[PDB]
Amino acid sequence: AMEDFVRQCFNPMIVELAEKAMKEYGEDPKIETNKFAAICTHLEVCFMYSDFGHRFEIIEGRDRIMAWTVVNSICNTTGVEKPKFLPDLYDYKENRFIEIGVTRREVHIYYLEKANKIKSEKTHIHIFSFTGEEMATKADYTLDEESRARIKTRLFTIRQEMASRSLWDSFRQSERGE
Numbered sequence: 406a407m408e409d410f411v412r413q414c415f416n417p418m419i420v421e422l423a424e425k426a427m428k429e430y431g432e433d434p435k436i437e438t439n440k441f442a443a444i445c446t447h448l449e450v451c452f453m454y455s456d457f458g459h460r461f462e463i464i465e466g467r468d469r470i471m472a473w474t475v476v477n478s479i480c481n482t483t484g485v486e487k488p489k490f491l492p493d494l495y496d497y498k499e500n501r502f503i504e505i506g507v508t509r510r511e512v513h514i515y516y517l518e519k520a521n522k523i524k525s526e527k528t529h530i531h532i533f534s535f536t537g538e539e540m541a542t543k544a545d546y547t548l549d550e551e552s553r554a555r556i557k558t559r560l561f562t563i564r565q566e567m568a569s570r571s572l573w574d575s576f577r578q579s580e581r582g583e
């Protein structure tokens with residue numbers, strides 16, 4: 406049911422990118438169905454965020470070779486510190502990487518996990534929940550209210566579609582994909 410749900414509510418490119426990523430690391434998306442849904446969800450949010458501005462460089466969704474090529478290449482032309490971990494976007498207006506978090510838990514909680522994981526980076530953090538809460542570094546939310554409203558609407562809709570299908574309770578308790 407969860408596998409059908411994802412093949413039906415995300416566009417084939419997101420599904421294929423997610424499915425490929427899982428199968429390369431030896432994860433079956435027919436088994437790790439919550440993870441599958443989360444990877445698709447987070448991918449879609451990153452694509453939506455980029456699309457609301459050539460203000461953003463999409464790093465998430467690329468193979469590792471291309472992602473590091475995009476990163477090293479931004480760093481050499483801007484001078485900005487090289488992150489330890491692949492972030493999700495680069496913002497050419499504010500001249501900072503963005504790490505995008507999508508969480509079934511509280512936003513402050515997942516914010517802290519992110520901020521701790523990348524403690525020594527100057528990467529901007531933007532957390533979304535499936536409840537329409539966000540939290541971002543210095544309460545700087547990067548996007549305009551409308552672009553953020555679209556993302557929150559899309560995430561709430563995924564939640565409710567999952568609930569229509571009696572999948573939400575599994576998904577929200579499953580913390581995998583975070």
Ligand SMILES: Cc1cc(O)c(=O)c(O)cc1C(=O)O
Nearest residue numbers: 447491493505506507582583
């Ligand atoms: C959990 C995780 C979450 C992310 O938001 C992310 O952007 C990412 O690139 C990777 C992972 C991850 O599986 O390490």
Ligand SMILES: [Mn+2]
Nearest residue numbers: 465491492493
């Ligand atoms: Mn990422």
Ligand SMILES: [Mn+2]
Nearest residue numbers: 493504505506
């Ligand atoms: Mn992310």
